[PDB]
């Protein structure tokens, strides 16, 4: 019994777009981030890719608080904020993954010493409290 | 491209003869180990060591009434 | 298949062949406690495959279940196994 | 159904062997209803020598005894050992069949090997039945494909979970739960389980359903095999064990109730481990349970199954599904405290539903109420759920003291 393999519903242009947007949203370059954030903020066809974005956010924060990597977290919180103000996509199916990610960001200890980025840490907490409200 | 692009590609199949030989070998070894441990645990058992049922259990030797029938006859034909 | 999987049942059979209802209540966020979900550094692998199984996603499994034993839309049938290849990493 | 005759075009062919050039179609119809009438009178008179001379074969000496009976001249040469051969001739537009007779040299019939001499008729006596059954004397009648290793493993593991003894069952379930290589035999186990739960409708066996649910519970505990591709088969089997109405052969004494809460715990585990937002397993399971519970006409067994699954899903589910329909308890206590119809089975199932409801709604009442709870039972339905809530608060205080 031999039959043909299944074809992914997501396209290879869409999968390449997801790879470029996620590799830009980890903030190696700031102009790349800002466009990728605006692209998340106004792509109409960003539904049907949203499970993979929510899973990338959620999974990221949890293995990114194992070592308290503040940028990795500040970029993910900006990705959450860019996901929220998009008017086309339906978010409250995925908010059960989004909310415990922002909760830990605000209520968690910093592996990294804070006398140095606590100002940065404080800003991140404020961002987390903005998105939470 | 995202505006109007679709790539209906297939799924890369495994043609690695090395890993296919390894997968079939390890699955055959694991299913025969599971089968022999299950049959040695739910029957009469022997042991090379004193009171050794967890590690190396042997299915006990039972005598046949007619032993040439189970010896000489082929089973897959 | 009479000699195929579930054969013991076939042998016993002797067959000759061969507002609370709203989805908002059932939304995961309503039923999921976020704080319990957070690991908080306390000690994944879900839907790793890019395509989720079509049979679970598009299958009307609810229809197959019969609420009442007395009334059944379909009477007992041979229900021969499809024997159709599924999953990935299969040797053949 | 109809009077069947020889075809009329078979008489045009015969009339040209005679020399008759043109024969009209009313003459051909006149010929074929007579010759097919005389065939049926020798077909049925040959059958009178086949029946009176007991033969059930209709040899060609039966027709020759009937042509002798109708005074018509015999047909010579049909007692020799022959058969039915026909030879097709294609031709340039004339399609026919013939015999293609063969020849033989005359000295090869004078010098044929003679057959053996026949025997004369003799009699033989033997017992057919001796005051009962027949004796066993010889004059009577006598009375992709799994390899063999894993085929034998599948056979032994499935027949160990049918109920001959309990110890082989426990070792088979501890094999299923703790072996590394049982893939390539997962589709066979899923088919076996789903068809076996289906076979409950022909035979309402509670025991074999408990065995199949312990087979599913053992399949879930295996770390090596991933049931994501086969969960669409195991979900409706456990669902059938939950929300079906006759789970018993004798409804009154069989504890279908436990196969209910066991399968409810099983489906809570199967939608904890496998529910993803692409799957929508848990939302689609809650929707089936909910529209089975809110809808009236449902039996107390299937309502028990719905409440059991919904209450094993978690705390927020019983907050937003169970607690709106707590007034339904009054509709239940309509048929419990009150009613001449007492000796029916609608009382044991109703107070089982009641006990499950107040057991699961006692911690929900302990979560969303005051600590005093003075007349919460009076405020509750029937004043019993409130007593259970007071007992639950007492149990929580005891747990805090233990901590």
Residue share in β-strands of chain A = under 5%
Question: What would you call the structural class of chain C?
Answer: mainly alpha
The ordered string of helix (H) and strand (E) elements of chain A is HHHHHH
The strand count of chain C comes to: 0
Overall geometric form of chain A: elongated
- Helix count, DSSP H or I runs of 4 or more residues of chain C: 6
Q: Helix content range of the residues of chain C, please?
A: 25-40%
The structural class of chain A is: mainly alpha
Largest sheet of chain A: none
| SSE succession of chain C | HHHHHH
- Structure summary, number of beta strands of chain A: 0
Determine the most extensive contact between two protein chains: C-D, 48 and 64 residues
Instruction: Please give the alpha-carbon distance between the first and last residues of chain C.
Output: 21 Å
Which term fits the overall shape of chain C?
Answer: extended
Major sheet characteristics of chain C: none
Beta-strand residue fraction of chain C:
under 5%
Core attributes:
part of a larger assembly, 4 chains, B: 77 residues, mainly alpha, two-stranded antiparallel sheet, 2 helices, 2 strands, 40% helix, elongated, C: 92 residues, extended, transcription, PIC, Mediator
Brief summary:
Chain B is mostly helical and 77 residues long.
Describe the structure.
The structure is cut from a larger assembly and holds 2 copies of chain A, 1 copy of chain B (77 residues) and 1 copy of chain C (92 residues). Chain A is mainly α. Chain A contains 6 helices and no strands. Chain A has helices at residues 12-24, 30-42, 50-63, 70-84, 95-107, 114-132. The radius of gyration of chain A is 16 Å and the shape is elongated. The longest helix of chain B is centred in the middle third of the chain and has 25 residues, at 17-41. Chain B is mostly helical and 77 residues long. The N and C termini of chain B lie far apart (59 Å). Chain B has a two-stranded antiparallel ribbon. With 92 residues, chain C is mostly helical. Helices cover 30% and strands 0% of the residues of chain C. Chain C contains 6 helices and no strands. Chain C has helices at residues 7-13, 23-26, 28-31, 34-37, 54-58, 61-64. Chain C is extended and about 60 Å long. The two termini of chain C are 21 Å apart. Chains in contact: A-B, A-C, A-D, B-C, B-D, C-D. Chain D: It is found in: Nucleus. Chain D: The modification Phosphoserine is found at residue 194. Chain D: This is Transcription initiation factor TFIID subunit 6. Chain D: Its main location: nucleus. Chain D: The modification Phosphothreonine is found at residues 112, 178. Chain B: It is found in: Nucleus; Cytoplasm.
């Amino acid at each position: 019994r031999l039959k043909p393999r299944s074809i992914h519903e997501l396209s290879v242009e869409q999968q390449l777009y997801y790879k470029e947007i996620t590799e830009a949203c980890v903030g190696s370059c700031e102009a790349k981030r800002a466009e990728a954030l605006q692209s998340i903020a106004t792509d109409p066809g960003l539904y049907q890719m949203l499970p993979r974005f929510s899973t990338f956010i959620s999974e990221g924060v949890r293995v990114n608080v194992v070592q308290n990597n503040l940028a990795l977290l500040i970029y993910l919180m900006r990705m959450v904020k860019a996901l929220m103000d998009n008017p086309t996509l339906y978010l409250e199916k995925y908010v059960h993954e989004l909310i415990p990610a922002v909760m830990t960001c605000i209520v968690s200890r910093q592996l990294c010493l804070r006398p140095d980025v606590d100002n940065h840490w404080a800003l991140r907490d404020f961002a987390a409290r903005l998105v939470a409200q | 491209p995202h505006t109007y692009i679709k790539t209906p590609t297939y799924r890369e199949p495994v043609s690695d003869y090395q890993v296919l030989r390894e997968k079939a070998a390890s699955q055959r070894r694991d299913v025969e180990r599971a089968l022999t441990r299950f049959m040695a645990k739910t029957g009469e058992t022997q042991s090379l060591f004193k009171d050794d049922v967890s590690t190396f259990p042997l299915i006990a030797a039972r005598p046949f009434t007619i032993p040439y029938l189970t010896a000489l006859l082929p089973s897959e034909l | 298949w009479r000699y195929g999987p579930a054969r013991l049942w076939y042998d016993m059979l002797g067959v000759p062949e061969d507002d609370l209802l709203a989805d908002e209540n059932f939304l995961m966020v309503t039923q999921l406690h976020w704080e319990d979900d957070i690991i908080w550094d306390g000690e994944p692998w879900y839907s790793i495959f890019p395509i989720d199984n079509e049979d679970l996603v598009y299958g009307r499994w609810e229809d197959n279940i019969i609420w009442d034993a007395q009334a059944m839309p379909r009477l007992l049938e041979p229900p021969v196994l499809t024997l159709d290849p599924n999953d990935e990493n299969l040797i053949l | 159904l109809s009077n069947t005759v020889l075809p009329s075009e078979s008489m045009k062919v015969v009339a040209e062997s005679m020399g008759i050039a043109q024969i009209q179609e009313e003459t051909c119809q006149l010929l074929t209803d007579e010759v097919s009438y005389r065939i049926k009178e020798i077909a049925q008179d040959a059958l009178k020598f086949m029946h009176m001379g007991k033969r059930q074969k209709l040899t060609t000496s039966d027709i020759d005894y009937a042509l002798k009976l109708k005074n018509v001249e015999p047909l010579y040469g049909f007692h020799a050992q022959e058969f039915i051969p026909f030879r097709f001739a294609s031709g340039g537009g004339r399609e026919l069949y013939f015999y293609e007779e063969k020849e033989v040299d005359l000295s090869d019939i004078i010098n044929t090997p003679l057959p053996r001499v026949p025997l004369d008729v003799c009699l033989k006596a033997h017992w057919l039945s001796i005051e009962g059954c027949q004796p066993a004397i010889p004059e009577n009648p006598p009375p992709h494909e799994l390899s063999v290793e894993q085929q034998l493993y599948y056979k032994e593991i499935t027949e160990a979970c049918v109920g001959s003894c309990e110890a082989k069952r426990a070792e088979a379930l501890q094999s299923i739960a703790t072996d590394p290589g049982l893939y390539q035999m997962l589709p066979r186990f899923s088919t076996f389980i789903s068809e076996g739960v289906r076979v409950n409708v022909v035979q309402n066996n509670l025991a074999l359903l408990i065995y199949l649910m312990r087979m599913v519970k053992a399949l879930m505990d295996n770390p090596t095999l991933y049931l994501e591709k086969y969960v669409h088969e195991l979900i409706p089997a456990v669902m059938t064990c939950i929300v079906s109405r006759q789970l018993c052969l004798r409804p009154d004494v069989d504890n279908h109730w436990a196969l209910r809460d066991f399968a409810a715990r099983l489906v809570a585990q199967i939608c904890k481990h496998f529910s993803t937002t692409t799957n929508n397993i848990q939302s689609r399971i809650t929707k089936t349970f909910t529209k089975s519970w809110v809808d009236e006409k449902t039996p107390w067994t299937t309502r028990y199954g719905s409440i059991a699954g919904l209450a094993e899903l978690g705390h927020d589910v019983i907050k937003t599904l169970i607690l709106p329909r707590l007034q339904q308890e009054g509709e239940r206590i309509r048929s419990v405290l009150d009613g001449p119809v007492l000796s029916n089975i609608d009382r044991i199932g109703a107070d089982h539903v009641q006990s499950l409801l107040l057991k699961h709604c006692a911690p929900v009442l302990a979560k969303l109420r005051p600590p005093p709870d003075n007349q919460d039972a009076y405020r509750a339905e029937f004043g019993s759920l409130g007593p259970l809530l007071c007992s639950q608060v007492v149990k929580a205080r005891a747990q805090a003291a233990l901590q």
